[PDB]
């Protein structure tokens, strides 16, 4: 029948079946040879009955409206001539982004350990969010956005599913770019506790990491981020491989002051 | 006989249902009060013959 | 415990396990019954390693950066007896 | 003397009790249409909102419980789309009815509708500072033909700071009188609820309704509560309120959800609040 | 229109439970066979099952022929007779009917004006208090137009919408009985007949003495506190000779309950031996 | 005319001919037994009478035998 | 044979998962489900009461709550993996 | 006392649950939120002073089915009702 629900697999004994349904109701389950069990893998969601939890029909990964929304037009209209100073930082940046999007052979012939993303630290007002309004324009690719607190939500499985969607959505629709504006929220440190509110926050971060270390430098995503702070956030993000290349956006020198006003 | 009465009375009503607990907020006009079940929300009620 | 039983019947064998400073959590920072995971997860560690008898077919290694942050409620006296810095 | 209380409460055991809730005198005979309206084709529904319409009709309940369902007489293909609030049976979960997006009460408890009385002629003769104030607020809404043609994009945000007793809130209740557009009286007490990531939800909806409307402006007050500084402590019990304000600053300056909405603040501690 | 016994054949019932329980949690529905009588004994004979899509709360009959292809397959043996009613099941929820039940029941009655529904609730149906019940709808048309005869017997005090709704539209709720005969009760009780070996099996002793000089150990401690419990017992009231001593393990009984017992199971152990001795 | 039986074993007989529309036939039991045909299921020898292939392609002779069936739903 | 296989499975409805605290008798054990409570249960004939001890993972029905089957080796190869050539 | 009070308890059950409402529609169609249950789409019985109620209010819900039946004056909080003077 039609009224049925969704679940997520975790294992296969030995045919066999196990699930973690959405209602927080695990089931061990004798073998369903209904669907070909070799036609699926763990975390591959499936339909399932309401009373006799058994696999009934697979189904796709349908993303949430609060994520598709973050797909973007090219409403940004800000050329690199609209920005002053920072000929370096933009020069350093684009040697991580479009060339791996287009001209990665100079890496791939060498096959060097490639970079995955970026970071733009420094104080308020050096042109952080602006520059991402620019790079989304000039490049002929898509682009994405999410403030960090747009992730955190009340319910105890509201966030992690959100983030596994985006990166998965970005492996789809590829090649893509990610923007995380105020990473200072989630990325602080380990706030050790057993309370609800202390866990559901960080457990998002634990997904973000596994998402970064899940793909490779072959599929053509390229993430970045931003912050007003670096003496506050967790170095696990800064570990070699995840977010390695950095940018110390300074204050502007006095020559740069002449450009900005003009 | 009064022995077998008890155990046959007692056993009759361990089959009986549970019984909740709660606290009073105020009293509505008559034969009507309100309660909050101390973990959960509100439930207007009626009362019995005695009280 | 499964990580040891599996390790037992495949004797001899070595263990390695990093980020070991995570078992502490609260480390009974308040003694509330909400961190039972952060407490017991140290317990089952200790009770099991005491069960080896130290015969010579199973040994264990651990590591971190902050041994001054370690939990010497155990793992100091006779369990992780030999401490070894590195240059 | 100790007999009075025996007699006094003896009255309490004489009258009884009395209470009401609601009712009506003239249309006293309501109760012929009720029962016929009750069991008919006016069952209740149990709301949700869709996520996908596969060529069936996945849903997600408020509480985390996701189904995949079909219809009765409601139109399947056409009227519905993604997103909206809906109607679902209580027994076997078919779709029957749409309904619009959510509009939280609180923000509509937060809009002002009746206009106060003061004016800039009732203020205490701080004649200059008002001129820096209104030049932000109303002239870019009444006489933009000056700011634009000469070539200046006006500002869209003020802040007020002075010692107390000085009339920071006065001049702000005033301008609502001379608004020529809406106004908001944000109650800072509703942004600090004790469920994580919630207050921030109230922030962004506060603006989704704004830019829906045309030319809204906003009056915070005592943002020293919310716009406090930041720090790192493994206790950090102000951890949560930091996550709220970030719903604000990311929303004020990034990727322009803003059109013409202005902002207004107030303080007695303008040093502590975060530079951002 | 009262005093209507509903006899049931014991071959019918236990088939109603088994298929009525094997499908648990999802509910289940089948049919009854029997025969009306003048007014009173609407008996029942035998039942069976229509195929069906069962849920925890709802079900229908998928196929519309397996009940028709089988009666015509039965009369070759003629082990039963025609149809008289239909049952269904509410697995843990109580015994009553619903707006779906009446819509289908309302067909049977106008089809045949004494047909019957039956309701069962196997989960709470323990080895004692079964809760089965049956029902015949009314004519509320005949109600607004607006019966006992010198006996009524039994009424319910539970199942709310079988107790406040159970009359205004549900049914003239109606008792049941059982046709337990001698010809079958003989073949019925043939389970508990233990065995002809099952009364001279002098089982092992290595628990016996381990119970004997274990039991006396458990006698004294209750005795010598009953030795305490007779100190004077005339203290401060006649009720104070009673209510200062709650019944928290009243001692004198507790020894007698084992005094007789250890006597009663040992006297068999000794007697059984000497009888077994003369097996040879 | 025609015969019709039941699951109870009762018989009803109708006055019809080879020109019969199932939407009209289904109304006939409603004429007599008072059944909405949604609760109906007619049979001819294992072949459920589909409402489309009207009886002209079913060899419904005179004095033929049918079987009526009621739908079953509960909850 | 396929279309006849699947129906042979659909009747075999699902189960529920738990874990043990301790043991009391072959007629009564204790469990701890994966959704909170700490039921008391019995046990079926087939499974060896020997293997049932503390720590084990367990499966049982939904209504009667009687334990039948066990699944060990809570595999998670992302967690650990052997190095046999290290021998 | 003969007709009014004889009818209300006929349709108002003995338990009348309590909740709130996030939004309303004319013609006896409305909404509820509440802790124990999820939201609902609900009708009205038209003797509540229908042009009274507002968002954030509190309500009197029939139990078997949900239905907005009446509304209370304040139901503000207990402790505020303590601090007042009676003596
Ligand atoms: N180097 C620059 N070139 C051009 N404009 C600049 C530059 N630096 C600052 N600006 C101006 O400042 C604004 C952009 O500031 P920016 O995006 O750096 O804020 P931010 O540091 O991102 O704030 P936060 O870090 O809190 O998000 C723009 O309005 C822009 O006109
Ligand atoms: N310039 C003024 N002319 C006339 N009255 C004034 C003036 N300034 C302050 N007041 C008086 O003070 C009150 C408001 O003072 P003000 O707006 O400074 O409060 P506030 O600074 O918002 O208080 P807080 O600092 O606690 O937020 C008014 O009710 C008014 O009576």
């Amino acid at each position: 029948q039609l009224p049925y629900l969704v679940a997520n697999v975790v294992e296969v004994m030995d045919k066999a079946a196990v699930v973690k349904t959405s209602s927080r109701q695990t089931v061990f389950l004798p073998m369903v040879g209904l669907v070909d069990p070799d036609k699926l893998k763990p975390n591959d969601l499936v339909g399932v009955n309401k009373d006799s939890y058994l696999i009934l029909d697979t189904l796709p990964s349908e993303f949430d409206s609060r994520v598709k929304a973050m797909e973007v037009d090219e409403k940004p209209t800000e050329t690199y001539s609209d920005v002053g100073g920072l000929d370096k930082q933009i020069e350093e940046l684009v040697e991580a982004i479009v060339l791996p999007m287009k001209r990665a052979d100079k890496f791939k012939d060498m096959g060097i350990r490639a970079p995955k993303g970026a970071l733009m630290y420094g104080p308020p007002g050096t042109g952080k969010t602006l520059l991402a309004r620019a790079c989304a324009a000039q490049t002929n690719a898509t682009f994405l956005k999410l403030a960090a607190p747009q992730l955190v939500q009340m319910y105890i499985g509201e966030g992690a599913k959100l983030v596994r969607d985006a990166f998965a959505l970005a492996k789809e629709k590829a090649p893509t770019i990610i923007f995380i504006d105020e990473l200072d929220a989630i990325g602080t440190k380990r706030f050790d506790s057993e309370k609800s509110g202390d866990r559901e926050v960080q457990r998002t971060m634990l997904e973000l990491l596994n998402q970064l270390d899940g793909f490779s430098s072959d599929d053509r995503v390229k993430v970045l981020a931003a912050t007003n702070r670096v003496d506050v956030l967790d170095p696990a993000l800064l570990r070699s491989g995840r977010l390695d290349r950095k940018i110390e956006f300074p204050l502007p020198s006095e020559d740069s002051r002449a450009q900005i006003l003009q | 006989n009064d022995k077998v009465r008890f155990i046959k009375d007692e056993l009759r009503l361990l089959q009986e249902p549970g019984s909740y607990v709660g606290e009073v907020i105020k009293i509505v006009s008559d034969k009507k009060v309100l309660v909050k079940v101390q973990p959960e929300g509100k439930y207007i009620v009626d009362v019995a013959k005695d009280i | 415990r499964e990580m040891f039983a599996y390790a037992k019947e495949h004797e001899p064998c070595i263990i390695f396990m990093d980020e070991v400073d995570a078992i502490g959590g609260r480390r009974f920072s308040e003694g509330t019954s909400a961190d039972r995971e952060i407490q017991r997860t140290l317990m089952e560690l200790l009770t099991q390693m005491d069960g080896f008898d130290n015969l010579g077919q199973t040994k264990i290694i651990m590591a971190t950066n902050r041994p001054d942050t370690l939990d010497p409620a155990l793992l100091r006296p006779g369990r992780l007896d030999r401490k070894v810095e590195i240059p | 003397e100790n007999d009075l209380k025996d007699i006094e409460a003896r009255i309490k055991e004489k009258a009884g009790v009395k209470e009401s809730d609601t009712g009506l005198a003239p249309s006293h005979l309501w109760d012929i249409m009720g029962d016929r309206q009750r069991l008919g084709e006016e069952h209740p529904l149990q709301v949700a909102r869709c996520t996908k319409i596969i060529k069936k009709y996945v849903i997600n309940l408020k509480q985390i419980a996701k189904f995949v369902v079909g219809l009765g007489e409601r139109v399947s293909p056409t009227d519905i789309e993604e997103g909206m609030r809906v109607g679902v049976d209580r027994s076997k979960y078919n779709i029957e009815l749409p309904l619009p997006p959510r509009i939280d009460p609180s923000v509509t408890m937060m809009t002002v509708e009746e206009k106060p009385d003061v004016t800039y002629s009732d203020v205490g003769g701080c004649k200059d500072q008002i001129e820096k104030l209104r030049e932000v607020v109303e002239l870019p809404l009444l006489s933009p033909e000056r700011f634009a043609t000469l070539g200046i994009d006006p500002p869209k945000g003020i802040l007020l700071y002075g010692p107390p007793g000085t009339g920071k809130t006065l001049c702000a209740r005033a301008v609502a009188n001379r608004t020529d557009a809406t106004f908001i009286r944000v109650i800072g007490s509703e942004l600090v609820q004790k469920y994580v990531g919630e207050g921030a939800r109230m922030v962004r909806e506060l603006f989704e309704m704004a830019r829906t409307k045309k030319a809204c402006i906003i009056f915070f007050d005592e943002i020293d509560a919310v716009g406090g500084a930041r720090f790192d402590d493994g206790a950090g019990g102000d951890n949560e309120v930091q996550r709220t304000m970030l719903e604000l600053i990311t929303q004020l300056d990034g990727f322009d959800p803003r059109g013409n909405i202005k902002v207004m603040f107030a303080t007695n501690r303008p040093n502590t609040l975060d530079p951002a | 229109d009262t005093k209507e016994t509903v006899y049931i054949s014991s071959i019918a019932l236990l088939k109603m439970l088994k298929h009525g329980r094997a499908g648990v949690p999802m509910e289940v529905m089948g049919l009854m066979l029997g025969e009306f009588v003048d007014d009173y004994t609407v008996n029942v004979v035998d039942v069976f099952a229509m195929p069906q899509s069962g849920t925890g709360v709802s079900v229908e009959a998928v196929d519309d022929v397996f009940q028709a292809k089988m009666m015509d397959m039965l009369k070759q043996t003629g082990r039963d007779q025609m149809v008289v009613g239909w049952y269904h099941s509410h697995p843990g929820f109580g015994c009553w009917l619903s707006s779906v039940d009446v819509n289908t029941q309302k067909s049977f009655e106008q089809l045949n004006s004494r047909a019957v529904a039956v309701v069962v609730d196997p989960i709470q149906s323990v080895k004692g208090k079964v809760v089965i019940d049956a029902f015949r709808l009314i004519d509320t048309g005949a109600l607004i137009n607006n019966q006992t005869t010198s006996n009524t017997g039994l009424l319910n005090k539970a199942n709310i919408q079988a107790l406040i709704h159970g009359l205004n539209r549900h049914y003239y709720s109606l008792n049941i009985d059982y046709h337990k005969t001698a010809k079958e009760t003989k073949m019925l009780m043939n389970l508990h007949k233990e065995q002809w070996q099952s009364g001279l099996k002098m089982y092992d002793y290595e628990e016996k003495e381990e119970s004997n000089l274990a039991a006396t150990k458990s006698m004294v401690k209750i005795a010598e506190q009953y030795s305490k419990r007779i100190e004077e017992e005339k203290e401060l009231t006649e009720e104070e000779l009673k209510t200062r001593y709650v019944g928290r393990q009243d001692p004198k009984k507790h020894l007698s309950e084992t005094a007789d017992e250890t006597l009663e199971n040992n006297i068999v152990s000794v007697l059984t031996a000497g009888v077994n001795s003369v097996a040879i | 005319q025609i015969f019709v039986k039941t699951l109870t074993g009762k018989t009803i007989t109708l006055e019809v001919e080879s020109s019969d529309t199932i939407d009209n036939v289904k109304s006939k039991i409603q004429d007599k037994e008072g059944i909405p045909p949604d609760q109906q299921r007619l049979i001819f020898a294992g072949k459920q009478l589909e409402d489309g292939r009207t009886l002209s392609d079913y060899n419904i002779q005179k004095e033929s035998t049918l079987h009526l069936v009621l739908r079953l739903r509960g909850g | 044979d396929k279309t006849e296989n699947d129906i042979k499975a659909l009747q075999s409805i699902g189960q529920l998962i738990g874990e043990v605290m301790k043991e009391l008798s072959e007629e009564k054990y204790i469990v701890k489900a994966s959704s909170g409570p700490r039921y008391i249960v019995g046990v079926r004939n087939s499974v060896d009461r020997s293997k049932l001890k503390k720590g084990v993972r367990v499966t049982l029905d939904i209504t009667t709550l009687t334990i039948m089957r066990i699944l060990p080796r809570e595999t998670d190869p992302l967690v650990y993996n052997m190095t046999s050539f290290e021998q | 006392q003969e007709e009014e009070k004889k009818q209300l308890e006929e349709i108002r059950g003995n338990p009348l649950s309590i909740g709130t409402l996030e939004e309303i529609i004319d013609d006896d169609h409305a909404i509820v939120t509440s802790p124990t249950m999820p939201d609902y789409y609900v009708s009205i019985l038209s003797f509540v002073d229908k042009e009274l109620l507002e968002p954030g209010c509190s309500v009197l819900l029939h139990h078997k089915t949900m239905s907005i039946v009446g509304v209370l004056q304040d139901d503000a909080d207990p402790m505020v009702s303590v601090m007042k003077m009676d003596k």
Side-chain angles (χ1 to χ4, degrees), chain D residues 21 37 43 52 70 120 124 134 150 158 206 213 248 265 270:
Chain D
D21 300 330
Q37 181 178 1
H43 275 168
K52 181 64 182 68
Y120 299 162
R134 62 179 288 174
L150 191 154
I158 198 165
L206 187 64
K213 197 176 266 76
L248 199 62
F265 287 105

Side-chain angles (χ1 to χ4, degrees), chain E residues 27 29 57-61 64-65 67 82-83 90 98 100-101 103-104 107-108 110-112, chain F residues 6 8-10 34-36 39 43 46 48 67 69 71-72 74-75:
Chain E
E27 74 186 2
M29 173 263 285
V57 299
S58 66
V59 58
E60 65 185 359
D64 291 331
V65 289
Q67 58 268 27
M82 68 188 181
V83 176
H90 291 173
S98 66
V100 174
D101 300 329
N103 285 320
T104 184
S107 174
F108 285 97
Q110 65 180 0
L111 186 154
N112 190 354
Chain F
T6 63
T8 57
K10 182 166 73 179
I35 292 164
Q39 299 181 358
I43 298 297
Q48 294 180 355
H67 302 287
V69 176
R71 189 176 73 98
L72 303 174

Side-chain angles (χ1 to χ4, degrees), chain D residues 9 11 15-16 19-27 30 34-35 37-40 42-61 63-73 75-178 181-211:
Chain D
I11 305 302
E19 181 63 28
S20 179
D21 300 330
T22 174
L24 182 64
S27 297
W30 56 81
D35 195 355
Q37 181 178 1
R38 182 69 70 79
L39 268 285
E42 294 295 329
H43 275 168
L45 290 300
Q46 183 177 1
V47 308
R49 59 187 295 275
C50 180
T51 301
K52 181 64 182 68
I53 298 161
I54 64 97
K55 186 263 185 292
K56 295 286 283 189
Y57 294 88
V58 73
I59 59 181
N60 187 359
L61 269 292
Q63 62 88 18
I64 303 304
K66 292 176 173 67
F67 288 173
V68 171
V69 304
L71 282 84
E73 63 272 18
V75 174
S76 302
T78 72
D79 58 351
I80 63 94
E81 304 179 355
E82 288 76 358
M84 61 294 291
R85 289 184 291 173
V86 299
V88 179
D89 289 335
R90 189 170 70 255
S91 294
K92 62 181 180 289
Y93 297 86
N94 296 113
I95 301 293
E96 294 86 10
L97 179 55
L99 64 156
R102 188 170 61 80
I103 306 94
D104 188 77
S106 69
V107 309
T108 63
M109 193 59 60
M110 187 181 284
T111 300
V112 72
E113 66 283 18
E114 65 92 21
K115 188 176 281 189
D117 57 355
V118 307
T119 65
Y120 299 162
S121 300
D122 188 80
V123 79
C126 294
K127 176 58 68 174
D128 189 1
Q129 284 82 245
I130 65 95
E131 193 272 325
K132 292 177 73 175
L133 198 152
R134 62 179 288 174
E135 191 170 5
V136 163
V137 164
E138 61 87 14
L139 297 177
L141 299 171
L142 271 63
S143 178
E145 294 87 2
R146 303 181 84 185
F147 294 107
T149 189
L150 191 154
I152 50 178
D153 185 77
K156 293 183 280 184
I158 198 165
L159 193 144
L160 278 77
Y161 62 100
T166 308
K168 302 181 284 291
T169 301
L170 191 291
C171 299
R173 89 179 79 178
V175 73
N177 194 355
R178 299 181 66 183
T182 193
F183 192 91
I184 292 176
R185 182 262 305 280
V186 68
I187 297 169
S189 292
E190 295 295 332
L191 289 75
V192 309
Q193 284 187 353
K194 65 181 181 72
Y195 291 145
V196 66
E198 178 57 21
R201 191 258 292 165
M202 199 173 289
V203 172
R204 60 170 65 88
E205 292 184 355
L206 187 64
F207 294 0
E208 289 184 355
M209 69 96 76
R211 63 186 181 270

Side-chain angles (χ1 to χ4, degrees), chain B residues 25, chain H residues 76 78-87:
Chain B
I25 306 295
Chain H
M79 59 288 291
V80 300
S81 182
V82 170
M83 55 176 65
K84 290 195 265 76
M85 282 176 65
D86 53 356
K87 67 191 171 64

Side-chain angles (χ1 to χ4, degrees), chain E residues 45-49 51-60:
Chain E
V45 171
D46 188 353
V47 308
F48 61 98
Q52 46 184 348
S53 174
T55 64
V57 299
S58 66
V59 58
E60 65 185 359

Side-chain angles (χ1 to χ4, degrees), chain D residues 162-178 181-237 239-246 248-270:
Chain D
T166 308
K168 302 181 284 291
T169 301
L170 191 291
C171 299
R173 89 179 79 178
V175 73
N177 194 355
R178 299 181 66 183
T182 193
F183 192 91
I184 292 176
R185 182 262 305 280
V186 68
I187 297 169
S189 292
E190 295 295 332
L191 289 75
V192 309
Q193 284 187 353
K194 65 181 181 72
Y195 291 145
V196 66
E198 178 57 21
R201 191 258 292 165
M202 199 173 289
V203 172
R204 60 170 65 88
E205 292 184 355
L206 187 64
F207 294 0
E208 289 184 355
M209 69 96 76
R211 63 186 181 270
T212 288
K213 197 176 266 76
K214 181 170 71 175
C216 183
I217 67 95
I218 289 166
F219 177 76
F220 291 84
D221 191 0
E222 298 293 336
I223 51 84
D224 298 331
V226 173
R230 283 182 282 177
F231 63 95
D232 52 351
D233 285 328
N239 285 113
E240 198 279 332
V241 61
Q242 273 79 247
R243 286 190 292 278
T244 303
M245 54 177 285
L246 297 174
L248 199 62
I249 64 174
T250 59
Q251 189 66 248
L252 291 177
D253 193 355
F255 291 94
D256 63 5
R258 293 180 74 184
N260 287 321
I261 62 170
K262 291 88 170 67
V263 185
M264 197 185 292
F265 287 105
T267 54
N268 298 315
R269 295 287 301 287

